[PDB]
Symmetry: C2
Subunit: 755 residues, 2 copies
C-alpha cells in the first residue's frame, strides 16, 4: 500500500504514522491493565478486541463533522480525529475520549484552513459531550505558500536592463499573461504604458490557491481560541511527537497538560532563522530552543517519554486518575493498599525527600521491605519534576480515591541554569534554592498545579510546610509578590475538597499561611495540623526579636535568677551610699550580660509555645489536630464523606440556586437529625458512619433526602412563577387559560372554589 | 492634644493621618476639575462644599457595617473606612466610591481581626453596590504578640540551678500562679511533681488577649480572598503611602491597580529579618526590596507619585476614565479636540516613540504648534511605563470616549538589570530588547493591561505592530510560550469592543497575529489594517528562504535575464569543442552568481506582494482597509455605535435570555429595516448615521422589546409548569389576584 510508504516516511521523521495511533492506544491500554493490577484489585481484563473502539471523524461538504467507518490512509487533509471508547481499570464499563492528530506526512503536517476546521469541530464535540480532548501534535505550523500561477510568469521592470544593480521599479504581467489569470482572482493589477510596451503592474497577489494565505492566520487564531476555552471546559492533554511549531506550540500549551517525547521540540522560531538574524551559527539544534531541556525544566512540559508508545501510555495513565467526563465523579479503585494501616515513614526535623512521605521508600535496614508512605503504594505520579523543585506536585490515590497533591521540598535545591549561547558572557550558573520556601518559580508551579487539577475535577491535598515566600531583592524584582497572589486566586476557584495538612516537623508561617488559609474558600477548604507541627504569623526567633527584647529578658531574670534576685533585693534598700549602689548596679549589669544568651533561649521557647496546634484549634483556625501514623485512615474517611456530602449538596443547589452554601449545610444536617433522631446528632461528626448513611440515601426509605429535594424544587419553581407574574401581571389571565386546558375535572372544580 | 499629636506622628512617618484623607480627596478633586477643563468642555465647577460628601463606616456590636456620624479621631481599631460621593468633571451629577485605610498610628498600623473585619465589610459593601474600592495602605502587616499575663509569671525548670548554661527542661507556673490564669483560657498545663515542689508544666500558651494569635492568620486570608474576588467584581485601586507589609502587600497586589509614593515600600519581609536569616548585612534598606525601583520596574506598581496628595489625585484621575459603577456605561466627555480632524503625526518606517502616535508631539519647526496624535489632546495616561517597555499601555479618550490602549515600541529598548546583593558574583547586566517583539515581560504586561482594562469596563484599542515573539533560548526558557497563550485567554474574556489596527508601516506576523485574531472573540473583536501595513504567517525574507530557493531564482534568471538567456541558448549549439563548452558553462555559473543578490531582492518583493491589506480583506481576515489620516474619525464613530448597538442588544438579551448573539443581531437589523424602510437598508452600514438612529431609539424599538419579554415570560411560565405539574393548582391561586371579576367569569366559562 501507500501505507507501507507513509509509515516509512513517518518513521524517517522519528514519529508514528497518524493511523497507527489508535492501535497504539490499544497496546498501551493493555500495558495499563497490567501495571494497575499491581496497585489495585481489578476484574479480569476484557479481550483486547473488546477493550477499545474507535470511529474516525471526518468533515462533510458543509464543514460539519461526520462519523465514518473507513479504511485507514484515507485522509484528504493534514488532520485526523477520532472518537474513542475504551474499557479501562478505572472505568471497566467504558469511557470516551476525542483524539485529534496532525498527519506529518500530508504537506509537512502544516495547518491549512480545513485542517484548522477539523480540529475546531472535534474539539467542539469533545466539549459538547464533556469528555477529554487528546491532541497528538506533530506539525509545521500554519501553511505557507506563494502563488505558483504568478511566480512563473511575472517580469521585472528594471531601471536599466543593461544593468540590473541599478535597481528595479516594479513587477508586472504582460497583457497576454494577465488575460488568463485575470478571470481567476489571482492578482490585482493596474494597467500602465511604460517604455513603449503595455504592462500590468502587480499591486496585490491574491493567489488562486486556497489555503496558502492570510486565511491561515484566522484559522489558527480560531483554534487557539477554541483551545483556550476547552481548557476551561474539559480535560485537555497533548503529546508532542516530532515537533510542534507555532500554532502547534500554542495549542499544546493552551491545553496545558503536556507530554513530550525526547528529541522532539516545541518552538516558535527555528535555530536557522535566528542564526541568520545573529550573523553567526549561535544555535546548532532546535532542541536548544524547544527541546525537553528547556520545556521540561520550565514547566511547559509535564512529563517526558522515550518514545511515542510511552507517550500514549502516559496519556492513558493520567486519565486513570480523572473522571470519565465533566458530568462525572472521580473514578474510585479498590486498592490493594489497605485503608486502616499506619504510615511507617515519619517526616523528620532532618531534611528529607518529601516523595518518601507520599509514596514511601525502601527500608534502610532489612531490605527489600518497604517504609510505607501516606498514599496508596504505587499511586503517586509526579509532574513538572525538574522545575521549581522547591515544591513537588502530582496525582495519587488515597484508598483508591484519586487526588491532586502538593508537597514541599525540605532539602536545599541546587538549580542549574544553562548558559545563553546568544550571549558570550554567559557561563552556566548554579543557584541555591532553600527548602521550605516559595520562590517565584515554586509559587507559579503551585498555582499551576492547583489550576490544572481543579479543572480535572480532583480533590486537592496540600502538605503545607512553608516558612514563607523569599522576599529578597532579586526575588521581589522577579515578581514573587505576583505569583503568591495567584495561589489565592487559584484556591478561591476550587470546586472540590481542598485538604491542607501541616505534617509532623513541618511549619507554616506568615505569608505562606495567609495565601492558603481555609478562609479563602471556606465552602471547600479545610486545614489540619499534626501535633508535631507549628504555625504563626511569625517564627519564634523573629518574634522574640521584636517582642522579647532586653528590657523584658532582664525583667525575667529579676523574677527567676536567684543571684540577680538577691542583688536586686539589696538595691531595694533605703539609705545606701552612692558607692555601695554603683557597686551593686555593676554587679547586676555583669550578671545580666552573663545571663542574656541562656535567657534568650528561654525566650524563643516561650514564643514557640504560642505557635502550637493546641492554640490553633482553640482559636478556630484549624479543624483538628491529627497524628501522622493514623493520618491516612483519617483522611480517607474524611475525604470520602466530603465527596458524598458535596454530591448531595450539589443536588440541593440545583433544586434552588438561591440557597446559600451555609443554609444548605444546615438544611442537610437538619434532615439527618429529622430522619435518624435527635438522639443520634453525634453521628454526623463521624466521617465513616455518615459516609455510609449518605451513600445509602444516594443509592425503600433511602428516598428520604431525595423526597426533600423534590420539595425544595417545587417550592422554588412556585417562587419563580410568582416572581414572573409579579413583574408581569397582564400575563396572568392568559397563563391560567393555558394552564387549565388539561387537569382533573375534580381540580377544575377546585379552581372555581379559589378565586 | 491628641489629633495634633497623631498628625505629627504621621508626618514623621512620611504619610498622612487617616482622617485627613477625605479632605485630601476634596482638594485633589478641585485640582481635577482644573486640569480636565483643558481637555474638555465642562460646566462650571460646583462649590467645594458641594463637591464631596463622606460618611464614616464603622463596625457595630454584631460585626456589621454601619454609617456613623462621629468626630474624626474616634477609631477604636487600626482601620477606617468611608463611603464617599462626589461631583466630578466626568460625572457632574455625582459618583460613589468606598475608601478604606489603615491607621498607621494605631498599633503601628497592624492587622488584627477587627481591622481585618472592617476591611472585609467595607469591601463587601463596595461589591454590593458595584462601586469602586479604594484602599489606602500604610501598615505593618499581621498583628503580633505574646501572652503578657503569662510572660510575667512563668518559671524555668533548670537542669541545674547552680549552673543555667547546663540547659533547662521546661517552663511552668507555680500552682499559686496557675490558680488564676486557669479560669481564663490563657494556658494549657499538665500538673507534675518535680524536685519536691508541685509545678504546672506549660504545654500550650493560648493567651487571653484577643488579636495577637493565629486568628490573625485566618483574618488575613479572609481579606486576601475578598480582595481576589473584589478585583473580579468591581474596580479596585490601592495607594501605598508609607509601607505595606505582608498581608498589606498582598491586598495591594490583589487589587492590581497600584499607585506608590516615592520612598514608600511594599514588602514581605524586612531587610532586618532577612539579614538575620542570611548571617550578614546583605540589605541596607527596605527600598532595596520593595521600593519603587523594584516595583515600578516589574509592573507591580502602575504609577509613582511624589507625595500622598498626588496619590489621591491619581486615584481620581484614573477613575475619570472609568464607569461610575459596574451597572454603568463608560463616562463620556465633550472634548475640545474635535472628532472630524485629521491626524498630523504619521508613523514611519524609521523607528519612533509610539507615544507620539497616541498623544501627539511638539512640532519640530514652528513651535509652539502641535503635531496631533490619534487620541484626544491630553487624554493619554500611561501605566507601568518602565516595565517591559517594548509595549506601551494606558488609557486615553477618543472623542471623549475613554478607552484602554496597547501600542508597540519600535525603537530598541535598553533594559538595566540590577545586581543581586545576596550574591557577590552578580554585576548589573544591560540587555537589548528589540522593538516590535513580544518578550515574556511585554507579553505579560500586555495580558495584564488587557485584564485590568476589561475589568474596568473599557473598550480596547490595540495598535498592533509585532513581528513575533522572541523565540531564542533565553526567552523560551523564560516561558515566553506561557505568556503568549495568556493573551489569548485575556482577549477571549473581553466583554466590550476590542478594535485592532495595524498602523501604517506597521506589520503583524505569525505568532503575534494568531494570539490576537478577531476569531478568538468574534462577538467583540474587530481587526483593521492601514493601506501601508503588512501581514503574514511569515515575513518575506523568511518565506523566500523556504519557498524561493536557488533553483527557483535561477529559473527566473533563465526567463528574464537576457545575458543568461543568450548563454543558455548557446550551450545548445551543436558540434562545440569541449573547450568552448566548459567556457560557456563557466560564463553561466559566473553570471548566475553575479545575479543572485539582486534576484533575491526581486524574490522578497514578490513575497511581499502576498502580504498586503488588499489580500487580507479579500480573504476575509480584516473588516476594512483604513487610511491613517482619517482613522480617528473612523474609529470614533465605529466605537460609538459598537457601544450603542451593544447597549440595545443587552436590552434584548434581558427581554429573552434564550436568544443567541446571532439571532439578536438579526432581530435588531430586521427591526431597523421595518421601521426605516427596505429602501434604507444601506444606512445600517454607516456608523455615524446608525449611531444617531440608535440613540434616538434609546432616548418604537422600546415597544418591540416589551413584546419580546411578554412572549418570553409566557413561554417561561408554560415551560415551568410543563416540567412541574403539581405546582399548577397553587400557581393559579396566586395568579387570580391579578384579574378582573369579569375575567374570573370568563375563566369559569371554561375551567
Amino acid at each position: 500500500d501507500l501505507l507501507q510508504s507513509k509509515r516509512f516516511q513517518a518513521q524517517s521523521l522519528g514519529t508514528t504514522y497518524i493511523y497507527d495511533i489508535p492501535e497504539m492506544f490499544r497496546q498501551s491500554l493493555i500495558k495499563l491493565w497490567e501495571s494497575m493490577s499491581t496497585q489495585a484489585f481489578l476484574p479480569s481484563p476484557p479481550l483486547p478486541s473488546d477493550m477499545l473502539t474507535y470511529t474516525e471523524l471526518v468533515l462533510d461538504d458543509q464543514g460539519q463533522l461526520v462519523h465514518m467507518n473507513r479504511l485507514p490512509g484515507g485522509n484528504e487533509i493534514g488532520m485526523v480525529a477520532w472518537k474513542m471508547t475504551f474499557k479501562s481499570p478505572e472505568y471497566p464499563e467504558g469511557r470516551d475520549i476525542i483524539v485529534i492528530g496532525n498527519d506529518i506526512t500530508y504537506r509537512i503536517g502544516s495547518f491549512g484552513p480545513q485542517e484548522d476546521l477539523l480540529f475546531l469541530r472535534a474539539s467542539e464535540l469533545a466539549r459538547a459531550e464533556g469528555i477529554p480532548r487528546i491532541y497528538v501534535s506533530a506539525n509545521s505550523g500554519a501553511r505557507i505558500g506563494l502563488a505558483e500561477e504568478i511566480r512563473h510568469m511575472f517580469h521585472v521592470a528594471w531601471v536599466d536592463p543593461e544593468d540590473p544593480y541599478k535597481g528595479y521599479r516594479y513587477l508586472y504581467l504582460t497583457p497576454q499573461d494577465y488575460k488568463r489569470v485575470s478571470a481567476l482572482n489571482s492578482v490585482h493589477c493596474e494597467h500602465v504604458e511604460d517604455e513603449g510596451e503595455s504592462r500590468y503592474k502587480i499591486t496585490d497577489i491574491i493567489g488562486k490557491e486556497e489555503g496558502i494565505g492570510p486565511e491561515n492566520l484566522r484559522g489558527s487564531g480560531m483554534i487557539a481560541g477554541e483551545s483556550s476555552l476547552a481548557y476551561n471546559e474539559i480535560i485537555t492533554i497533548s503529546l508532542v511527537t516530532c515537533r510542534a511549531i507555532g500554532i502547534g506550540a500554542y495549542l499544546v500549551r493552551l491545553g496545558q497538560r503536556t507530554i513530550q517525547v525526547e528529541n522532539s521540540h516545541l518552538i516558535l522560531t527555528g535555530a536557522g532563522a535566528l542564526n541568520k538574524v545573529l550573523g553567526r551559527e549561535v544555535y546548532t539544534s532546535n532542541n536548544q530552543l524547544g527541546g525537553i531541556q528547556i520545556m521540561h525544566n520550565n514547566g511547559v512540559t509535564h512529563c517526558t517519554v522515550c518514545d511515542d508508545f510511552e507517550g500514549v501510555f502516559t496519556v492513558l495513565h493520567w486519565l486513570s486518575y480523572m473522571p470519565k467526563s465533566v458530568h462525572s465523579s472521580v473514578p474510585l479503585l479498590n486498592s490493594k493498599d489497605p485503608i486502616d494501616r499506619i504510615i511507617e515513614f515519619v517526616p523528620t526535623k532532618t531534611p528529607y525527600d518529601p516523595r518518601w512521605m507520599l509514596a514511601g521508600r525502601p527500608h534502610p535496614t532489612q531490605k527489600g521491605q518497604w517504609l510505607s508512605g501516606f498514599f496508596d503504594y504505587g499511586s503517586f505520579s509526579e509532574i513538572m519534576q525538574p522545575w521549581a523543585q522547591t515544591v513537588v506536585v502530582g496525582r495519587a490515590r488515597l484508598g483508591g480515591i484519586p487526588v491532586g497533591v502538593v508537597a514541599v521540598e525540605t532539602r536545599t535545591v541546587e538549580l542549574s541554569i544553562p548558559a545563553d549561547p546568544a550571549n558570550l558572557d554567559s557561563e552556566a550558573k548554579i543557584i541555591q534554592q532553600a527548602g521550605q520556601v516559595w520562590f517565584p518559580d515554586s509559587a507559579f508551579k503551585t498555582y499551576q498545579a492547583i489550576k490544572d487539577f481543579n479543572r480535572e475535577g480532583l480533590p486537592l491535598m496540600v502538605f503545607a510546610n512553608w516558612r514563607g515566600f523569599s522576599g529578597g531583592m532579586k526575588d521581589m524584582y522577579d515578581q514573587v509578590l505576583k505569583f503568591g497572589a495567584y495561589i489565592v486566586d487559584g484556591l478561591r476557584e476550587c470546586c472540590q475538597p481542598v485538604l491542607v495538612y501541616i505534617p509532623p516537623q513541618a511549619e507554616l508561617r506568615g505569608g505562606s499561611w495567609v495565601v492558603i488559609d481555609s478562609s479563602i474558600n471556606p465552602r471547600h477548604m479545610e486545614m489540619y495540623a499534626d501535633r508535631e507541627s507549628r504555625g504563626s504569623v511569625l517564627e519564634p526567633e523573629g518574634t522574640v526579636e521584636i517582642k522579647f527584647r532586653r528590657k523584658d529578658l532582664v525583667k525575667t531574670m529579676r523574677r527567676v535568677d536567684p543571684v540577680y534576685i538577691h542583688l536586686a533585693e539589696r538595691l531595694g534598700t533605703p539609705e545606701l551610699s552612692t558607692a555601695e549602689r554603683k557597686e551593686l548596679e555593676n554587679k547586676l549589669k555583669e550578671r545580666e550580660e552573663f545571663l542574656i544568651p541562656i535567657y534568650h533561649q528561654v525566650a524563643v521557647q516561650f514564643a514557640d509555645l504560642h505557635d502550637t496546634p493546641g492554640r490553633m484549634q482553640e482559636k478556630g483556625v484549624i479543624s483538628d489536630i491529627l497524628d501522622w501514623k493514623t493520618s491516612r485512615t483519617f483522611f480517607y474517611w474524611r475525604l470520602r464523606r466530603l465527596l458524598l456530602e458535596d454530591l448531595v449538596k450539589k443536588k440541593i443547589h440545583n433544586a434552588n440556586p438561591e440557597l446559600t452554601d451555609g443554609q444548605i449545610q444546615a438544611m442537610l444536617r437538619r434532615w439527618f437529625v429529622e430522619v435518624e433522631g435527635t438522639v443520634k446528632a453525634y453521628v454526623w461528626d463521624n466521617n465513616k458512619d455518615l459516609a455510609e448513611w449518605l451513600e445509602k440515601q444516594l443509592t425503600g426509605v433511602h428516598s428520604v433526602i431525595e423526597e426533600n429535594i423534590k420539595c425544595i424544587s417545587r417550592d422554588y419553581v412556585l417562587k419563580q412563577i410568582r416572581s414572573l407574574v409579579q413583574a408581569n401581571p397582564e400575563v396572568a389571565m392568559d397563563s391560567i387559560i393555558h394552564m387549565t386546558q388539561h387537569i382533573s375535572p375534580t381540580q377544575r372544580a377546585e379552581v372555581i372554589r379559589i378565586l
